């Protein structure tokens, strides 16, 4: 299995994790499992326990989720038994429970010089649960929490607007994976007044930062400037292929990306799916994808999602051909 471990700077208090990618289902969240190891010394008068933080460092780490469980005085998973058997008797398990309605791990893109929702799992030994402990006698293992594409495809999007002519738009499908081109139908039924000389088709995602008040930020990740012109009292139709990628979006600011583990670069932020029956205050970041066409003005909005499917084996969470 080759679980992931993060040894502390001092020769003690290591933590074992079977994975660093916890999926977020619509209903429940996969619990965090692992083993923290403590030597017989340094512990005879102390007690070991763990703590995870839902940091919101935007510099100012506005913590959101804090949970503490004591590993040194519930059922245990199969991987939990294997670690206990292999490591030895002097190993005390730790587990975590994540409730729903929490934001996923998304990090905004900075320019020429992170900020976003990140989760850190730290283990330290004390009694007062509030004593100031140095980072040397602790571990700092970063975990990621993301969502993946659902099995059931969604309905074909379709918009409508007749304000000033009459135009309609549609997409091939709702489920889009990262890097896949987007096909849009821009069939217009203009009747009179003006002959529109351009068709602006742009893809934008919503960076709904809901830290305190609200946010509806707009970023045109992909766009095009086709110079086709409609005619007065005539019909028109056209297709297009826009692909949202990161090669031309390096200079942009405020762009939302996927979860981060180091200074390595990632793809665009996956769309976040909330609960229809329960939409309370998130205090995080919500990312939703929208495709629009503009007649030059009038425009329409067509929903769509852009996020990865279920990985076959496991994500390394790092660009594979490094250095």
């Amino acid at each position: 299995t080759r679980v992931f471990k993060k040894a502390s700077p001092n020769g003690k208090l290591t933590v074992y994790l079977g994975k660093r990618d916890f999926v977020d289902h619509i209903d429940l969240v996969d619990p965090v499992d692992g083993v923290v190891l403590v030597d017989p010394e340094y512990l005879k008068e102390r007690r070991v326990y763990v703590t995870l933080t839902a940091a919101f460092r935007y510099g100012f780490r506005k913590d959101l989720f804090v949970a503490n469980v004591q590993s040194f005085p519930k059922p245990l998973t199969r991987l939990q038994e294997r670690l206990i058997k292999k490591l030895g008797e002097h190993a005390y398990p730790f587990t975590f429970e994540i409730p729903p309605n929490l934001p996923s791990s998304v990090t905004l893109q900075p320019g020429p010089e992170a900020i976003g929702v990140d989760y850190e799992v730290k283990a330290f030994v004390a009694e007062n649960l509030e004593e100031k402990i140095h980072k040397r006698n602790s571990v700092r293992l970063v975990i990621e929490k993301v969502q993946y594409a659902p099995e059931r495809p969604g309905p074909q999007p379709t918009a409508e607007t007749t304000r000033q002519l009459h135009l309609e738009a549609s997409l091939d499908k709702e489920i889009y994976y990262h890097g896949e081109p987007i096909s849009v139908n821009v069939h217009v039924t203009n009747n009179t007044n003006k002959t529109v000389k351009k068709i602006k088709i742009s893809v934008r995602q919503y960076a709904d930062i809901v830290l305190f008040n609200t946010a509806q930020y707009k970023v045109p990740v992909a766009m095009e400037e086709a110079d086709d012109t409609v005619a007065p009292s005539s019909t028109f139709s056209k297709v297009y292929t826009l692909t949202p990628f990161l090669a031309n979006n390096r200079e942009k600011r405020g762009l939302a990306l996927d979860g981060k583990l180091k200074h390595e670069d990632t793809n665009l932020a996956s769309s976040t799916l909330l609960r229809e029956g329960a939409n309370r205050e998130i205090l995080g970041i919500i990312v939703s994808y929208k495709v629009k066409v503009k007649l030059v003005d009038v425009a329409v909005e067509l929903p769509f999602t852009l996020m990865h499917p279920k990985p076959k084996e496991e994500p390394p969470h790092r660009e594979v051909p490094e250095n």
Partner: single-chain antibody, 222 residues
Framework: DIQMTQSPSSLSASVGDRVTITCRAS??????VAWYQQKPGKAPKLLIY???SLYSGVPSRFSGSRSGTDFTLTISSLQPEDFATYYC?????????FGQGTKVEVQLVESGGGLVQPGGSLRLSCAAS????????IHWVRQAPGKGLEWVAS????????YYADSVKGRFTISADTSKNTAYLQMNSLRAEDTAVYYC?????????????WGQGTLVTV
């Protein structure tokens, strides 16, 4: 860099035996090891993309295991359909290296290649269909006559990154257009050691899992 040596260079076996080929990398790499089977006069075919996960299509008899850095390939039964020079790769770093080769005893179209004495320039095309440029990574691999596979260049259109081998730096330039879904390779000041069969292989841009598809051959003589 990383150098790989395979203990069995020339292996002879029969039908109905367990043949095991090992692989020793001169560094502590992760499970990012891929095994390729290349029949004579044909492009290599991927077998295992994570040193433990079998590819979709290959039989379940093939299997791999790890012990420190002791990557190996185990074959339950050696039917005659599996006689080829197996290779061994590490895709954990930019200078991907293939093994010396163990002798056992969506379509990509490429056009170009010809007799070009040194000092000339040659342009190779890699026409592709069935997949998108932004959702895949294009890799160019050359194979000298009788030698093993050697990595030449690679391009990633999603992040706009280009990688070249240390022996073809500056001389070789790779470009790809998204409109026609084609990969183009430009080489300048060709030396006499460039005589090799050039293959254009694709890979998944997101979460690289080996070179799934290959070409057929663009033999270049210099």
């Amino acid at each position: 860099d990383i150098q790989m040596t395979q203990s069995p260079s020339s292996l002879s076996a029969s039908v109905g035996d367990r043949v095991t080929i090992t692989c020793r990398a001169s560094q502590s790499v992760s499970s990012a090891v891929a095994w390729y089977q290349q029949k004579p006069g044909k492009a290599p075919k991927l077998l295992i993309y994570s040193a433990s996960s079998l590819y979709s299509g290959v039989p379940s008899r093939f299997s791999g295991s790890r012990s420190g850095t002791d990557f190996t390939l185990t074959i339950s039964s050696l039917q005659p359909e599996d006689f080829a020079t197996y290779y061994c790769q590490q895709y954990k770093y930019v200078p991907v290296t293939f093994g010396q080769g163990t002798k056992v005893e969506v379509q990509l179209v490429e056009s170009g290649g010809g007799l070009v004495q040194p000092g000339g320039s040659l342009r190779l095309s890699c026409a592709a269909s069935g997949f998108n440029v932004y959702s895949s990574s294009i890799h160019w691999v050359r194979q000298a006559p009788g030698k093993g596979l050697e990595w030449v260049a690679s391009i990633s259109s999603y992040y706009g990154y280009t990688y070249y081998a240390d022996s073809v730096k500056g001389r070789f330039t790779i470009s790809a257009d998204t409109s026609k879904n084609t990969a183009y390779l430009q080489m300048n000041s060709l030396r006499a050691e460039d005589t090799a069969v050039y293959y254009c292989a694709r890979s998944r841009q997101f979460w690289y899992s080996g070179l799934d598809y290959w070409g057929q051959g663009t033999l270049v003589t210099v």
